[model samples]
Target chain A: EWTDSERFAITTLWAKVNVESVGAQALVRLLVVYPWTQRYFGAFGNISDAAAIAGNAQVHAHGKTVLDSVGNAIAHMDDVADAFTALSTFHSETLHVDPDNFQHFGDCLSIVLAATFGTAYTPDVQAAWQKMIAVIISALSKEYH
Target chain B: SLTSADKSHVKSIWSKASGKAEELGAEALGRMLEVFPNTKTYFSHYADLSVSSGQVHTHGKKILDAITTAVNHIDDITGTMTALSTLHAKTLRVDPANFKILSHTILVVLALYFPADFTPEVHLACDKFLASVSHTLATKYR
Candidate 1:
C-alpha cells in the first residue's frame, strides 16, 4: 500500500542493488544473527563451517531465490500476496517454518541494505522495504485453505 | 493532523456509510484477504476467510467500528487511539505496513460501494484520515 512516491523510492533502490551478492549475504546474516534459524536449513548439511556454507549450492540457490522472489513481488506490487503463495505453502506445510521467521529474515535484509547503501538507503527507502517485507510476511504467513 | 477540509470530507462520507459499517466492513475485509492472501497470515486462527465467512464479517465489523471511533474523535486521533494502539503494537504485534495495506483496502471497498459520493477529493481526505489512524496505531511501538 505504498504511495506513488514511496513505491518509486524502493523500486529505485532495487535497481541500484546488486542482487547476486546481497541475496546470499542476507541469508548468511540471518543464520549468523539468529543462529537458531539454521535448524530450518538442514538441507545444507554441515552448516557450521564458514567455507562449507559459503560454497553450498543449495544455500546460494535458495538465497538468490529469496531475493528473486522479492524482486518478482516488487514487479507485481499490486498483487504482492500472490507472488509468494506457493512459497508460503511450501514454508508452512512442507518446511514447517514458522510464520514469524519472515520477520527476522526481513530485519536482516534491512540491515544488509543499510550497511550496503548507507546514505542512499534513506528512511523512505527503509520504510518501503519494510512495507514490502511486511507484505511478504503476510503472504507467507497465510494459512490458506 | 487532518486539514479542516479533509476532516469535513471524511466526516461527511462517514455520515453516509456509518449505518452500514458491518456490511461494508465485511466486504472490504473479504476483498483484502481474498486479493492479498498474505495479509491473512496473522488471521490463521480463523477457520475460513471466504467472502461469506461469519468470522470474516465478525472481525471485519470490529475494524470498521474502530474507524468509526476514529472519525468520532478526529480532533485527537492519537489520544483516542492509545489503548488500541498499545494492543496492536504489544499484543497483536502486526507489522506496521499491514496497517497501511488494510487501510488502503478499506478505502477501495468504500469507493466500490459509494459510487457518486467517493469523489477524488473524498478519497484523498479519507486516505489521509486513515493514514493518521494507521500512524497512530504504530505510535506505541515508538
Candidate 2:
C-alpha cells in the first residue's frame, strides 16, 4: 500500500525523531489515557503519569524496547505483518492486550509526532506515516488476544 | 442535487443508521484523523482520541445528530447550514475543507459497516446528499 515518494517522506522524518524519547512519550500517553493498560505492566509499578514513567527506570527500559520494535517496523515497511509476527504473537499471548489498544498506541505515537513536529508533519506527511503505522498495527493485531 | 427518489432513499438509510448514530460517527471521526492526519491537531484538546473515548463518542454523536438535522431539512437545507457554517468558521475556526473530508469518511464508514444495504443507487444518492450538505455547511465560511 506504499508508494516510493511516500516511503521517503516517512524515512526522512523518521530520522529526525529520537525514537527512545518518542516511544516513552507515546507509552506514557497510552497508560494515562487508558489506565486499564497499566494492569499489564504491574511490574513497572510507579508509571502513574508522564513524569512518573520518565523517572521510572523500568518503563524506560521497556520504552527502548518499543523504540527498537518501531525501528524494525520502519525498516520492513513492505511486509510488516511477517516482520513483526513474533512481536505480535508475544503481545497477543503474553501481554494479552486487546488488538484495539494497538490502534490506540499507534494513534498516541502519531499524536506525539504531530505535537513535536507541528508544521513539518503536514497532511501529506501524516498520511504517509498513517499508512505505515496502520500496517504495523495490523501486524500487532495477531488476533490471539 | 438530489432527486425526489434520492431524498427518499437517503432518508430510509438514515433510519437504519440513526440507531447506531454515535458508533458510526465516532468511527468516521477516528478515520478522518487516521486518513487525514492534520485533522488530528484540531482535535488535540480531546485528550483521548481512542475509539472508546467519551470525548470522541460525544462529538461523533453530535456530528451525526447534526447531519440528521440536515437530512430532515434536506429539501431546503441552505438556511439550516448557515448557523453551522458560522459556528464552525467564525467561532470554532474549523477549516471548511474538513466538512468535505469528514463527509467522505462518513461515507466510508457507512459502506464498511453496511455493505449489504448500501446499494449503488443508495450510495450515489447519499454521496450527493453529503456533497450538498458539506457544501452548504462550508458556505458561511467563505
Candidate 3:
C-alpha cells in the first residue's frame, strides 16, 4: 500500500507520459520494453516498490548524480537498441526474402517481450508503459522522415 | 630507482588505482550474488522493501555483491563499465527513481564497508560509472 505522498511521487514520473517530455518518452520505452529484453534481469524486486523507490531516489539524489545516472542510462539504451536494430535490419533485409528463416527474426523479439513483462505488477502498468513508449517512438521515428 | 617526480606520479596513479580496486572488489561481491540465481534460492537473505525517512532499504545481497565486485575491479574502469553493462542488460531493473536512495546507499555502504577508501574522487567516479550503467540497463526497455 502506498501513502498519499508515495502515490504522488510515483505519478509524477508519468506526469509527462502523455505529452512530450524531453527524454521522458525514451525512458518510458526503456522501462516498458526492458521486461521483455531479458527475464532474469527484468524481474528483480517488487515492481511497485521498485518504481516508488526509483521515483523517490531521483528526487533526493543531488542534481549531478541524477543527471549523470539518467543521462548514462539513456546513452547505454541507445547503444543496446542500436545493436538490436542493426541486427534486426540485417536479418530483415537478407533473411526476410527467405521463407525458411522468416521466424528467426522473432528470436530477439521474444527476448524483448519476455523482458517487458518480467517486472510487471498489473496489466495497467504494462499497458501504460508500452502505450507511452509507442506514442513517443512513433512521433520521434518520423523525425528522420 | 624512482625519482621524486616519478614517485609522485606513481603515488597518484596508485592512489587512484587503489580506490578503483576497492570499488571493483565491492561491486564484484555485490554482482556475484546478483548474477547467481541459485545463491538467492539458498541464502534467503532479503532486505526490507520500504522507504523510511526517504531511504529505500534493499536487502538484496546480489546488489551488495555487485557493489563489492565493482569496487574490486575498480582498477580496470573500462572492464568495470563493460561488466556493469552486462549486469544492467541482464537485470533490466532499476529503482525507477531512487537515484538519491541509491547514491546515499553507495555513500553509506562505502563508509561502512570501505571507510578507509572513502574519498571525494571515489564517490564521483562511482556515480559517473553507475550513471552510465543505469543508462545502459534502462535503454533496453525504451
Candidate 4:
C-alpha cells in the first residue's frame, strides 16, 4: 500500500509541471523513444517523423487529453477501480488497444519522467511511480485481459 | 539544474544509447567491485562473478532495469528510495558508501556509452542526479 508521504511526493512533483505543456512534452518524448507506438494514435498514425509528430497541433491536443485522463485517475486514487472504468472501456472496447501496448506506453512514460525531472528524478521516486502506473494499467486491463 | 531544453536533449541522447545499457551497467558494477573490493562484501552470492564472468550479464541487466525504472519515476521517488534504503540498511546491512561508489562507476560507464553526447554539461547534470540518488539511498542508514 502507498503511504501518505509517497502519495504527497508524487502529487507534489506532478504539480510542478507547466500543466499546459507537460503532457505534450511527455507524449513527444514517448514518440521519440518508441516510434512504433505512434501508429496507435489516429492523429499520429500517418506521421513517421518524430519531429513532425511532436510539432503537430492534433497530437498535442490529444496528448493533453491523455494527460487529463491520467490526472483524473490520479485524483481518484482511492477508488481506482471506478476511476479507470471509463478509460478501460473506451481504450479497450472502442479503440481495441492491447494490454501489451499499455505496458509499452508505460515504459515510454518512464523515459519522459526522467527527461522532464532531470536531477530530481531519483531511483526511489521511480519505484513509487512505477507502482502507481502498474496499478493504473491493472485497472485499465481488467476489461480486456 | 537542467533546463527543459537540456532535459529534452538528455532524453534524446538516452533513448539512442539505451541499447548499450546492459553492457554499461555490467561494466560499471564490475568496476565498482574492482576499485572498492570491500563493496563486494554485500554481494556474497556473487562471490564468483568476476568482471568477465557470465554471471555479470544477469547482474548487469538487473542494474540497468533498476536504472530504467528510476528514470521513469524520477518525480515521485521518495517511496522507492524509502523502500530501497530500508532494504539495504535493515535487511541487507550494506554499507551506504557503496551506493556512492556504484553511482560514480555508473557515471563513468554512461559517459563511455554516449561519448559524443556526454558533454561537460551532461556529465555535471548526471553527476548531480546520481548524487541525489545516493543521498536518498543513504537516508535510512543516516
Q: Judged by DockQ, which candidate is best?
A: 3
Q: What is the DockQ of the complex in model 4?
A: 0.05
Report how far residue B5 has shifted in candidate 2, in Å.
51
Better of 1 and 2 by lDDT: 1
lDDT of 1 by residue, B1-142 (tens): 6899999999999999989888888888888777766567667788988768899889889989989899999998998888888987567756555677789888988898897999999999999999899889888754
Model 1 Cα displacement at B2 (Å)? 1.2
Each prediction's fraction of true contacts recovered: 0.00, 0.07, 0.17, 0.00
Question: Model 4: per-residue lDDT, tens digit, A1-145?
Answer: 6788669767977787554476776566556544566667765555566557667887778778877777776788777768788778888889887787675555445445555675464544554565666777888898774
Work out the TM-score per prediction. 0.57, 0.53, 0.28, 0.54
Q: Could you arrange the candidates by lDDT from highest to lowest? A: 1, 2, 4, 3
Candidate 3 lands at a TM-score of 0.28
lDDT score for residue A35 of model 4: 58
> C-alpha displacement of A104 in model 1, angstroms?
9.9
| Candidate 4 Cα misplacement greater than 4 A, ranges | A44-46, B1-142
Worst 10 residues of 4 chain B by lDDT: B118-127
Give every collision pair in model 4. Answer: A110-B72, A121-B74, A124-B77, A124-B80, A124-B81, A125-B76, A125-B77, A126-B73
Residue-level lDDT tens digits of model 3 in B50-83: 2221112233344545544544554443454565
Candidate 1 local lDDT, A95-140, one digit each (tens): 6565567898999889989999999888887888888888877888
Tens digits of per-residue lDDT for model 2, B39-63: 8888999888766789989999999
Query: In model 1, how large is the Cα lDDT of residue B102?
Result: 85
lDDT of 2 by residue, A32-95 (tens): 5556677889998887654575577777677768877888999998888888888888888888
